[PDB]
Design a protein around this ligand. Structure first.
Ligand SMILES: c1ccn(-c2oc(C3CC3)nc2-c2nnn[nH]2)c1
Ligand SMILES: [Zn+2]
Length: 195
């Protein structure tokens, strides 16, 4: 009833990477290594690098899923709030209830788990382009952390899993996410609080 969040590089040396976007007031997505926390604006591009030490098999996939970070909320499905699930901002592929979308990939698949009712979005692994050492996926988060009747100010984690063609676990990594109006300011504030 609770997805694992244990970091696991596995046989292929799987791990995430994040850009260095800084903390200017205008920044739309920014990652804090000290907090292991991504700060982003609503529905804006969040680039996440997918690193491996060795090539996984054809048919390997990468899945993203959100869970609540606090243990007392972890069995609750993370979903869009009663406003945003109804605001008709469909991209033609993501169900309107899903918090996490993949941008610009027609092979993205959206799962409503028939047993756990959790949402996830999964894409096929592709080889890096010539000149690149990794591929990058672009996520969008479709509700604010503060949305009433939804996340309601509760922090979430995103869990990224590398899966074989059956859905078996090959690798796992994760990061906290705050979806907010001013990611640069909030990253600076939280890093200062940590210090
Ligand atoms: C996301 C995570 C791994 N991959 C990946 O998939 C593949 C072929 C199976 C398609 N090669 C890579 C690779 N990435 N960096 N180097 N090689 C995509
Ligand atoms: Zn919302």
């Amino acid at each position: 009833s609770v997805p694992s969040q244990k970091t696991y590089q596995g046989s292929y040396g799987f791990r995430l990477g994040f850009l260095h976007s800084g903390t200017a007031k205008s920044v739309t997505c920014t990652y804090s290594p000290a907090l292991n926390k991504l700060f982003c604006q609503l529905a804006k591009t969040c680039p996440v690098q997918l690193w491996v030490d060795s090539t996984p098999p054809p048919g390997t996939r990468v899945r993203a899923m959100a869970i609540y970070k606090q243990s007392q909320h972890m069995t609750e499905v993370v979903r869009r709030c009663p406003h945003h699930e109804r605001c008709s901002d469909s991209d033609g592929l993501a169900p309107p209830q899903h918090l996490i979308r993949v941008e610009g990939n027609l092979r993205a698949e959206y799962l409503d788990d028939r047993n756990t009712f959790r949402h996830s979005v999964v894409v096929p692994c592709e080889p890096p382009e010539v000149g690149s050492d990794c591929t990058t996926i672009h996520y969008n988060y479709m509700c604010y952390s503060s949305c009433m009747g939804g996340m309601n100010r509760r922090p979430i984690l995103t869990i990224i899993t590398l899966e074989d063609s059956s859905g078996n676990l090959l690798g796992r990594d994760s990061f906290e996410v705050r979806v907010c109006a001013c990611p640069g300011r909030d990253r600076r504030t939280e890093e200062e609080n940590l210090r």
